[PDB]
Design a binder for this molecule. Sequence first.
Ligand SMILES: C[C@@H]1O[C@@H](O[C@@H]2[C@@H](O)[C@H](O)O[C@H](CO)[C@H]2O[C@@H]2O[C@H](CO)[C@H](O)[C@H](O)[C@H]2O)[C@@H](O)[C@H](O)[C@@H]1O
Lengths: 314, 307
Amino acid sequence: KPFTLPILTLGELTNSRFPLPIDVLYTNPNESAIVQCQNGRCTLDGELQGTTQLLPTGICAFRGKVTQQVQDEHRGTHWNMTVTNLNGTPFDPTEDVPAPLGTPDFSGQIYGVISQRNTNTVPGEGNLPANRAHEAVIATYSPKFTPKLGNIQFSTWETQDVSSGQPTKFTPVGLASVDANSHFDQWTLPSYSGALTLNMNLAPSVAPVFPGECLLFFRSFIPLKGGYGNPAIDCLMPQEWVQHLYQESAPSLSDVALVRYVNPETGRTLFEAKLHRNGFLTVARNSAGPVVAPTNGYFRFDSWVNQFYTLAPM
Amino acid sequence: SKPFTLPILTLGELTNSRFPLPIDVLYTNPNESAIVQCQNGRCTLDGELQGTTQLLPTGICAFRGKVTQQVQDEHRGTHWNMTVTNLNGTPFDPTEDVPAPLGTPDFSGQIYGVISQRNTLPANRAHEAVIATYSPKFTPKLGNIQFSTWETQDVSSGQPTKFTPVGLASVDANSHFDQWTLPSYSGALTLNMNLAPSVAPVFPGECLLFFRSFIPLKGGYGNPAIDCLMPQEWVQHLYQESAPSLSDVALVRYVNPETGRTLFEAKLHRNGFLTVARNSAGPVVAPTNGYFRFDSWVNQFYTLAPM
Ligand SMILES: C[C@@H]1O[C@@H](O[C@@H]2[C@@H](O)[C@H](O)O[C@H](CO)[C@H]2O[C@@H]2O[C@H](CO)[C@H](O)[C@H](O)[C@H]2O)[C@@H](O)[C@H](O)[C@@H]1O
């Protein structure tokens, strides 16, 4: 079964690490951090890895139930919630995953909305449940962020109107802050089971192996609740590629596919890249920053090569 | 002839094409009195997007643009006029043969979400916001809409602005939630244009089959839902494949892959919607692992096995 990529321009792609459109292709050869994100991880033959799942609505989302209001030193009102799998089934910590699928894979203050629809209905309102929603922040670096143990903590500006024991949804929107005390680092994994435990069942780190090559990312800019900043989230492959590879499950005929970024109008190749078996791209480039390319461009599979193939310089 | 296919995705692997929500259940309502003519999640079986349908899950009920100024309105809150562009940032051209910018909401109600701004390091702000799509100030086809905030002051004019949808503000009577009532995209007293066609069963005993999602509420009593004709992944798949339609009606089977058994069959119509032979309203209670598989091309006279 021939390997294929979908035919989608950057303007038709979304980020696999946060619910955002892809804005630009991006490189940063001098990156000092280990790149080991857990969302948007899929092998070329269709095996999802890390915390990766298929739903665009599931990325950095949580489902569960608030247990109670809790105490925390930080400003705001704090709440504990148990989390389930996104499909509502109980999360089994013995499963070979780092955390419930969809769990955020970076350190920071994730801003979004907590909403609730009560289980109990009220006769005075046509047997319909009561509802509420409020802005919320989940600090993934907090010792109380323990999704692999089945519960996390979120804060609200709202001081009162969050109900205990009721079905609860977190819809991610952006970051609360990227100032020094908000610990935003897109390549630092949360400690899924708490302070000082080792994460397990991780998708592997990724890196170029050929001299002169660097990782190529699909970059999205992420909204901020407040403060100064222009934060971005870089994924290895867009969510549509994860979805495509999963559907196709085409056998990988080598460890590296040669792909070309093409301008369909001219038919000309804008640059070429290596698409590695574990599900990431490298290019021959010696600079950091956006890849300035025609809007109509997209990657096309060329052939299976090997790790010694020399890419044409971007 | 390139064979027609559907993706292999359980309900738990599908998302709504009319609001950014997971699909919760399959659903029927044979006694529905409204004309079904939604504009998002519209795609022919040979891959032609229609109405306001676009490919991004992040674009559904989203807006991009710039606030012009604070304005006044009868509705509760503080109100803001915003010009809207295409979701890709290019200027929206009202002369294009679309009902409204792609992604524009296709139903009447108070849509709740978050407005965020990043100034042209830049300063930022975000606030809860509501867009009343039934309002005379909801004029996306004219290039501008109005949103309200609880926040009274800190919304900046002339700055890049994003609306991220989250749910509904209310489904009280005065919030005019009706998922089958289209907004007037050019405002009061104007006719919508370039619409995807209405859909309906034509065969006796048949009813539409929907992919249903429950939509969050900011407050109040209710259990509102949004029904789409096909999930967003089907729109994305059909667009990619562009397989020729060999008749007006495809026969599809909802299969349990474990047992291999067919749970029921349905008609998948050329314009991009499903019908089944069912005489009841409510969820289709089916195993979690089930999904639709293309069987064969049939015609309008094919008699579906009763569900
Ligand atoms: C059902 C209720 O909805 C929300 O409170 C609403 C609020 O959104 C609206 O603006 O004002 C009404 C009051 O007229 C609020 O509804 C009352 O909330 C009470 C509790 O605060 C109580 O439930 C009354 O029966 C409601 O009429 C939510 O904020 C609230 O938690 C609750 O789900």
